[PDB]
């Protein structure tokens, strides 16, 4: 038959890919980083505690100036904080309180959100009326909208729970590119620093590197055993770490095309919800379900530190573009800014 | 004195006014009831919404006896259930619509599975979920008027081969209700209210109001520490 022919061809191709990947692993990262000195202990104290949310905080994102925050909570509210003085600069009421993502524009003018209504709302912050209007409502996804990232003030990259990501032009409101190829629900995005590539992790134990220009899945990385909940690029854009639901972070490489490192600890069996590198890429901060965030030495897979100031499950993390602070949102309706 | 400039003090004023508005809006929201509406496909959810004077989440608001209810229908959300049910952790009750005649019907492409078994599988998955350890459930056994014809024609031996009762509506309904309520594994932390409805039953909102009042008073007595 033709179906079995195509399936056997696909299996031969998968075996060829695995053989080519094994032919490049001449050494491991733990064998090359054996003589490098360890990081030591990292004790980071809670500098700020932002209160004002009345329900679970589901996402946050630092402004590009490393001072302003946006944080979305199923109170129905999207609050824009001034993290230096804990002032609430803005408070935006959502039309649908089931928000699961938010994003702050890299210019500071717009703020996106979305959630269990399949609609990405673009709010304009700097209007002449001093108010905060809904600049756009991008619709077209058929599942819950899990993540959201501003490519530019005009283009946005969303990823929804109908096994697809999309690239919207905000000025018109139409999907100019639909990245398909995943089979499970897409849960996280991470744009490259050079903003020409982005990776997406599904509920399929698979992350995919897409080219945002053409709309073709460049590469596919497997290796996890459960759902992938968070991805972040390494600061140079040639590696990325995925946190999965089986209590494991994994550092994959783009040029080597393989999994490089496995961050796991035997006393940790809780799913991971947030991953973010430090500014230099030496630290990997991972938010877990056991109410704390572990800080791993990203080059040795040691566990350099713990951030254990929260009372409920830790939602999205954030590291400033200056690398000065680490903001942590959680389900106990508090943000905590560590340093 | 406080080293803040004029604009800093005015920014703190704006922050405090935003805090006041947030507190007032949260107080307005906390006085509302949030009912999560669940059930198998074509169990009669839409019939229930039509009876109670009313893509993504379909959110329906209605007031009754100076109590505002917000009913969240999530049957349109076709994705992994375990990826978004945890955002409904703080609802006051889970209405669960189960069709009664559906014990002798099959819906999906899987023709070998009787859809009442799938319905109570879904009930067992929702009731024993780790996010709803203390969220009360309000059963609604729908279309009891059409149940009697199927009782006369086809007994429960099709759906329950271990059936001991006779072909009468009362014993069959009692056995179905018992089989459903015995799927609860958290009988001490959570109550299951059951009600038999039909198309003309206009006492549905009254039963929902009674159950919600019970759950609210029990929650208040739990916050007081008395219960």
């Amino acid at each position, epitope marked *: 038959s033709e179906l079995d022919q195509l399936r056997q061809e696909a299996e031969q191709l998968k075996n060829q890919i695995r053989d080519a990947r094994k032919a490049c692993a001449d050494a491991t990262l733990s064998q090359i980083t054996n003589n490098i000195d360890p990081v030591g202990r990292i004790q980071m104290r809670t500098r700020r505690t932002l209160r004002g949310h009345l329900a679970k905080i589901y996402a946050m994102h630092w402004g590009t100036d490393s001072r302003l925050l946006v944080s979305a909570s199923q109170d129905g509210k999207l609050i824009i904080w001034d993290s230096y003085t804990t002032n609430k600069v803005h408070a935006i009421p959502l039309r649908s309180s089931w928000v699961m993502t938010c994003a702050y524009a890299p210019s500071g003018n717009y703020v996106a959100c979305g959630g269990l209504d399949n609609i990405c709302s673009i709010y304009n912050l700097k209007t002449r009326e001093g*108010n905060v209007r809904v600049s756009r409502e991008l619709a077209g996804h058929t599942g819950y909208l899990s993540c959201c990232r501003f490519l530019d003030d005009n283009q946005i990259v969303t990823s929804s729970g109908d096994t697809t990501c999309a690239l919207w032009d905000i000025e018109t409101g139409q999907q100019t590119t639909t990245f398909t190829g995943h089979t499970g629900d897409v849960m996280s995005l991470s744009l490259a620093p050079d903003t020409r590539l982005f990776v997406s992790g599904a509920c399929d134990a698979s992350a995919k590197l897409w080219d945002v220009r053409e709309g073709m899945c460049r590469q596919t990385f497997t290796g996890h055993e459960s759902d992938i909940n968070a991805i972040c690029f390494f600061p140079n854009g040639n590696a990325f770490a995925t946190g999965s639901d089986d209590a494991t972070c994994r550092l994959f490489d783009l040029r080597a095309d393989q999994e490089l490192m496995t961050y796991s600890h035997d006393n940790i069996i809780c799913g991971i919800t947030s991953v973010s590198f430090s500014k230099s890429g030496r630290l990997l901060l991972a938010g877990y379900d056991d109410f704390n965030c572990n800080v791993w030495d990203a080059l040795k897979a040691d566990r350099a530190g713990v951030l254990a100031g929260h009372d409920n499950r830790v939602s999205c993390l954030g590291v400033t573009d200056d690398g000065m602070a680490v903001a942590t949102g959680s389900w106990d309706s508090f943000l905590k800014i560590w340093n | 004195g406080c080293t803040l400039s004029a604009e800093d003090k005015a920014a703190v004023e704006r922050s405090k006014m935003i805090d006041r508005n947030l507190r007032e809006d949260g107080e307005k929201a906390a006085r509302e009831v949030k009912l999560l509406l669940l059930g198998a496909g074509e169990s009669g959810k839409n019939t229930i919404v039509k009876q109670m004077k009313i893509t993504g989440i379909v959110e329906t608001h209605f007031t009754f006896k100076d109590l505002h209810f917000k009913m969240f229908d999530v049957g349109a959300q076709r994705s992994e259930r375990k990826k978004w049910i945890h955002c409904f952790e703080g609802v006051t009750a889970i209405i669960f619509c189960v069709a009664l005649s559906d014990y002798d019907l099959v819906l999906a492409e899987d023709e070998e599975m009787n859809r009442m078994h799938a319905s109570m599988k879904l009930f067992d998955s929702i009731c024993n979920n780790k996010w709803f350890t203390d969220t009360s459930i309000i059963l609604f056994l729908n279309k009891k008027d059409l149940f009697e014809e199927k009782i006369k024609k086809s007994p429960l031996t099709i759906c329950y081969p271990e059936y001991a009762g006779s072909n009468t509506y009362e014993e069959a309904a009692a056995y179905i209700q018992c089989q459903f309520e015995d799927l609860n594994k958290r009988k001490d932390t959570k109550e299951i209210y059951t009600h038999f409805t039909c198309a003309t039953d206009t006492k549905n909102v009254q039963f929902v109001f009674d159950a919600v009042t019970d759950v609210i008073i029990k929650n208040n007595l739990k916050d007081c520490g008395l219960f």
Partner: single-chain antibody
Amino acid sequence: VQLVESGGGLVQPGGSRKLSCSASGFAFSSFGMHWVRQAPEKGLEWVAYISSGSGTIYYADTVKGRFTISRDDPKNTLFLQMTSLRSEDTAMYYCVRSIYYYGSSPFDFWGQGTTLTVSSSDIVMTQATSSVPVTPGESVSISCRSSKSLLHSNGNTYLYWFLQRPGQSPQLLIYRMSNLASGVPDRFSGSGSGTAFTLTISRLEAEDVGVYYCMQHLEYPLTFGAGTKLEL
């Protein structure tokens, strides 16, 4: 965005009046509002301030006790109730919008102003000259010297540059000594430090002629300057 004042006219000394500033086209309930008067020739002087809700109310020491601000949010209206007018209050009064948060642009919109004629420590800011001649196309530089160091400890300097065209309300040009206001062409630039500030303009036009004022926002009362005038 529109602010229209009303209630001017001729008043006998010692009388009373009530100026009303009707706002239309913005979220009036969230903006702090100011009344700023201008004598027939002397330049701008700050009068009074009302907060975002009805919070802190400040007054210039020369009008403390005689004037009072009311604010009606549901009708979008500002009120300056004056009692016991003197011959020093004959002036054109401007209603001024200003919102304060991080990165905000206060004093950004000025009403058209109403004329009130009456029948018959502090940060002093000095502008160097009263008039300098210009030709359209050459760069110019205006100076403003404060008496106190406007550089606050949190990093901000709080000097504002306004321009008043002949026969119009003064618009905002530069806020906090560096930042341009939205809608201002990038010919104006601000610089300086401590107690010395400069506004450098690139190639001039026929619409850049006017009077340039500097102001300090450290502490109330906000003290304007003399007003450097340009002539073609």
